């Protein structure tokens, strides 16, 4: 019943006595599968998980500078040298400055100057690699077994969870009295992860192309670089400016967080649950074999007592109708008489039922159930029950 | 002597017996002004200050979000409303979500949802206005009065400081025994501040155009908005995204510090000393009247004792020569005999002197002085002194 209320709901009808039905499960969608003499089953791809991602590279987008130092030499005294030129954590540049008697040189002219500053990253982003073998799809199954909305549970037979991976694309879910349903899916179908990375920055996540990621002009440290990082291409965020042949100063460029966010406008979004990555985009083609699917209550005898609407029947966005009733009898489990008719005399069936074999299951009194009906276009009467105590509700579609 | 050693040094020669000389002072430059029967004077525009700047506008380039809240209504129950819609510190958006029996609604369909979040600025930039009346130029004057390099001072007559503003563009500096020099400058000349703002962000400063500043797409609060700011156009850094007709979430764009830094690549830089803005760019055209300028030691008698080089004469970047000597006599103050000659017999003068009237001033023994000479192209002899004890140094230019 998990598809009732979902706007992006697709209806797939299988052959009567058919063996398998082909379906396409999409994130945000829900499929209600029906077949003659078979129970109606809702199927949904709920999560796509990427596990065991390996860190590929980290890019510094916000940097800071500390510990500025300089070495100077007089004209004709050669090139200046600073010990920090041998520390990979410092960035350095050489230039020429005006020197003479006024600033301690025996000669007038250009003297060599080197300036260094310690690079440290304030804020960085991390690209992790994806291995096609590790993604795992989770599928939720909910049978239309006449359970009422608000089905609290005290292994629920109405629900099943199925997990399919590229190395195990086939599964079978047991549904208790309904038997079991088989799923043979095609996880190979979809977007190719051969050139896709998982990018994380400031707790936001994307899927990006590998070549684009390798070509971004930022400082970067290797995936296996742990602890204190060693930053390559620090000059992408650090620049030296000279002023009036007197000084040179080093400035750090501002955060490029906005720039990457802008470059990521046309990119797929993601989230993370713990060390696992969660995707909210994609699809999955499956073929479900239903030879082992059965109707649980096809053998019940009909309910004889009276039903009572506990809620007003409500139209879903697709024109289907939901009916919730209460039963005051004790002969449960039993079949619920439920139909649609334009003529209260003939009771000739019009339209069709979506939930096959609606049934009350409890033997205790005052038990509720819910079913779903597919009325014909125009006016009709929802008829529940038999004989004098049958209840009716006139419903009009379009 | 403040121009000795400066690479960007310009030489301006005035008329002999002339009244005024026109000069162009630039930041990073230095001018040595000479005239017959007049002392040689170095002049430099050292600082350009903008004071009393008024705050025009502040732009938020790094924002954060807190206190997310939502209001929801069932289908046909109308539009949702949140109290935070009446708080200017919150940004809000409305959308439609799938509702039905499963999530507490009597009807199936689209229900109204509003989501709000409290906007706060992490990092902002400030644009201040500039009034042409308030900038002030500071000019340093250093006479070539035969003072030696390393002139420590125990009101120095060799140096003068002059300040000129648009409302007082004329000044006169007193130089003790040299008289006084007048400056009539044209501060109106230069870049027009009618459409120029002073932009400050992350302790870096620029001069930007007014229209560009008014059109930047960021949240902004008014210059007179003090204390807790009220941010206009918060939507420039805040956006709402929907997911699967289930939720909407609000994200803040990353820091645009890099973007503005990039847009400011072709822009003039500045610094700040306290509440005053300092400019390291611009020029200033002046006309200096020297009718009151005089040679201090033109009346001295010549030195009779011997001189001694205390440093090796050194060539400046323009081909001029510096000579520092020590005097072991006591007849100071006296004129220093100093000349250039190719023939040690005739002592016919060749070339010319840059420092007019070189003199030793102290009456105490072993006192030092420094002068500057403009030799002819080729070979020559620097000759200091008279008679047997005169000293020579052969110097070749180009």
């Amino acid at each position: 019943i998990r598809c009732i209320g979902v706007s992006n709901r697709d209806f797939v009808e299988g052959m009567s006595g058919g063996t398998w039905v082909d379906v396409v499960l999409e994130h945000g969608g829900c499929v209600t599968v029906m077949a003659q003499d078979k129970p109606t089953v809702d199927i949904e791809l709920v999560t796509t998980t990427v596990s065991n991602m390996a860190e590929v590279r980290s890019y510094c987008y916000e940097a800071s500078i500390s510990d500025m130092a300089s070495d100077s030499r007089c004209p004709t005294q050669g090139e200046a040298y600073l010990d920090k030129q041998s520390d990979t954590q410092y960035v350095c540049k050489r230039t020429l400055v005006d020197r003479g008697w006024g600033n301690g040189c025996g000669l007038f002219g250009k003297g060599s100057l080197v300036t260094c500053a310690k690079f440290a990253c304030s804020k960085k982003m991390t690209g992790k690699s994806i291995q096609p073998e590790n993604l795992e799809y989770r599928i939720m199954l909910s049978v239309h077994g006449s359970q009422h909305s608000g089905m609290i549970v005290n292994t629920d037979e109405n629900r099943a969870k199925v997990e399919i991976t590229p190395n195990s694309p086939r599964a079978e879910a047991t549904l208790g009295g309904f038997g079991s349903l088989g799923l043979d899916c095609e996880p190979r179908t979809g977007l190719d992860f051969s050139d896709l990375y998982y990018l994380t920055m400031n707790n936001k996540h994307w899927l990006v192309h590998k070549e684009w990621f390798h070509d971004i002009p930022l400082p970067w440290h290797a995936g296996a670089d742990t602890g204190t990082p060693h930053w390559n291409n620090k000059e992408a965020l650090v620049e030296f400016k000279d002023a009036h042949a007197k000084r040179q100063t080093v400035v750090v460029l501002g955060s490029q967080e906005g720039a990457v966010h802008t470059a990521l406008a046309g990119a797929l979004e993601a989230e993370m649950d713990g060390a696992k990555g969660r995707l909210s985009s994609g699809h999955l083609k499956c073929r479900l074999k239903m030879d082992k699917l059965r109707l649980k209550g096809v053998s019940y005898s009909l309910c004889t007592a009276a039903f009572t609407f506990t809620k007003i029947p409500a139209e879903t966005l697709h024109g289907t109708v939901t009916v919730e009733v209460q039963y005051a009898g004790t002969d449960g489990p039993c079949k619920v008489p439920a139909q649609m008719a334009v003529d209260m005399q003939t009771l000739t069936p019009v339209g069709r039922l979506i939930t096959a074999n609606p049934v009350i299951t409890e033997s205790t009194e005052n038990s509720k159930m819910m079913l779903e009906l597919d009325p014909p276009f125009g006016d009709s009467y929802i008829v529940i029950g038999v004989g004098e105590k049958k209840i009716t509700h006139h419903w009009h579609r379009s | 002597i403040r121009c000795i050693g400066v690479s960007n040094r310009d030489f301006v020669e005035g008329m002999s017996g002339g009244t005024w000389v026109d000069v162009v002072l630039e930041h990073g430059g230095c001018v040595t002004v000479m005239a017959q029967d007049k002392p040689t004077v170095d002049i430099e525009l050292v600082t350009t200050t903008v004071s009393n700047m008024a705050e025009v506008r502040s732009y938020c380039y790094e924002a954060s979000i807190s206190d997310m809240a939502s209001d929801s209504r069932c289908p046909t129950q109308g539009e949702a409303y949140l109290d935070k819609q009446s708080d200017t510190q919150y940004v809000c958006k409305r959308t439609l979500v799938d509702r039905g029996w499963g999530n507490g609604c009597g009807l199936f369909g689209k229900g109204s949802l509003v989501t709000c979040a409290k906007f706060a600025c992490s990092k902002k930039m400030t644009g201040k206005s500039i009034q042409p009346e308030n900038l002030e130029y500071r000019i340093m004057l250093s006479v070539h009065g035969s003072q030696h390099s390393g002139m420590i001072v125990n009101t120095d007559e060799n140096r003068a400081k002059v300040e000129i503003t648009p409302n007082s563009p004329r000044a006169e500096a007193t130089l003790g025994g040299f008289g006084s020099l007048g400056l009539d400058c044209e501060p109106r000349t230069g870049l027009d501040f009618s459409d120029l703002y002073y932009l400050t962000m992350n302790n870096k400063h620029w001069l930007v155009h007014k229209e560009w500043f008014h059109d930047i797409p960021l949240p902004w609060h008014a210059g007179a908005d003090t204390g807790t700011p009220h941010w206009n156009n918060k939507e420039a850094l805040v956006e709402f995204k929907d997911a699967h007709a289930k939720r909407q979430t609000v994200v803040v764009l990353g820091s645009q510090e890099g973007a503005v830094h990039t847009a400011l690549a072709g822009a003039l830089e500045a610094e700040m000393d306290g509440a005053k803005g300092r400019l390291s760019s611009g020029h200033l055209k002046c006309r200096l009247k020297m009718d009151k300028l005089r040679l201090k030691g033109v009346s001295y008698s010549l030195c009779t004792a011997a001189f001694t080089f205390t440093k090796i004469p050194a060539e400046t970047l323009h081909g001029t020569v510096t000579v520092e000597v020590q005097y072991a006599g006591t007849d100071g103050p006296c004129k220093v005999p100093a000349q250039m000659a190719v023939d040690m017999q005739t002592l016919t003068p060749v070339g010319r002197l840059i420092t007019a009237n070189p003199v030793i001033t102290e009456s105490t023994e072993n006192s030092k002085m420094m002068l500057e000479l403009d030799p002819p192209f080729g070979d020559s002899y620097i000759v200091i002194g008279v008679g047997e004890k005169k000293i020579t140094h052969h110097w070749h230019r180009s």
């Epitope: 100077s72 301690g104 040189c105 025996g106 | 050292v46 390099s149 390393g150 420590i152």
Partner: antibody, heavy 128, light 109 residues
Framework: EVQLVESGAEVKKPGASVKVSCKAS????????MHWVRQAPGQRLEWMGW????????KYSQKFQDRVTITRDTSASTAYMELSSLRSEDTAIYYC?????????????????????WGQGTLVTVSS | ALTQPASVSGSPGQSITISCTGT?????????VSWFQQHPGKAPKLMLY???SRPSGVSSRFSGSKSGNTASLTISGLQAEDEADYYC??????????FGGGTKLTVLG
């Protein structure tokens, strides 16, 4: 007349922090950088660092890079030297000594006559 | 870091020389060589700056020179007032300052 007057002598424990002051009079304080040079009893002088009184920029010796902080109050025309994580080796007389800033307000190269005037010195004794 | 003799002595009237040896990064590199005199209990006094130049008020009996990496302070006509400790100093290529070990000058009484 140029004078540099420094705060009184101090006795402190190892691991403590000392702040000694240096008030300048007789000259324009904002035109000069103030240096801190110390001297253990019977030992040589050791340059510790300097502060540009005009704009607040500092330069420390790499051996004192972490433990020293030099600051200034312009209204009081006073420089301050703060040494933290004291050890027994810091017992010394601490002098301040000025040198002129350029006419652009930057202190990049000293004047050749640097340290032309010195304060009288402050004895600080670090012991437990 | 700068090596100068621990003590030098001379008779009144004689001349003496104090050497100050550095490296190509402080003394042999720049003219920022200064000489300071310190009397016991008093702050240092600048005697020589810019290896040859003298500040006003210092007797011309004090003179300076420099050759290669070694600077020198010569004091002629020694007087008993000259007994003090003498420290050379230099600005370095790294923008720091270095002082010598100090020389005790004794005018022999």
């Amino acid at each position: 007349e140029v004078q540099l007057v420094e705060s009184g002598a101090e006795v402190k424990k190892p691991g403590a922090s000392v702040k000694v002051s240096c008030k300048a009079s007789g000259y324009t304080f904002t035109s000069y950088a103030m240096h801190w040079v110390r001297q253990a009893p019977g030992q040589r002088l050791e340059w510790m660092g300097w502060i540009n009184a005009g704009n607040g920029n500092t330069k420390y010796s790499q051996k004192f890079q972490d433990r020293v902080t030099i600051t200034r109050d312009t209204s009081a025309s006073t420089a301050y030297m703060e040494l933290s994580s004291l050890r027994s080796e810091d017992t010394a007389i601490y002098y301040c000594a000025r040198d002129k800033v350029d006419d652009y307000g930057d202190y990049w190269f000293p004047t050749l006559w640097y340290f032309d005037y010195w304060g009288q010195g402050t004895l600080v004794t670090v012991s437990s | 870091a700068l090596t100068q003799p621990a003590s030098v002595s001379g008779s009144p009237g004689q001349s003496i020389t104090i050497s100050c040896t550095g490296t190509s990064s402080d003394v042999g590199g720049f003219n920022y060589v200064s000489w300071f005199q310190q009397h016991p209990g008093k702050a240092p006094k600048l005697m020589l700056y810019d290896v040859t130049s003298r500040p006003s008020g210092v007797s011309s009996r004090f003179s300076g020179s420099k050759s290669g990496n070694t600077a020198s302070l010569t004091i002629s006509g020694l007087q008993a007032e000259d007994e003090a400790d003498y420290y050379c100093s230099s600005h370095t290529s790294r923008g720091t300052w270095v002082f010598g070990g100090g020389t005790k000058l004794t005018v022999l009484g």
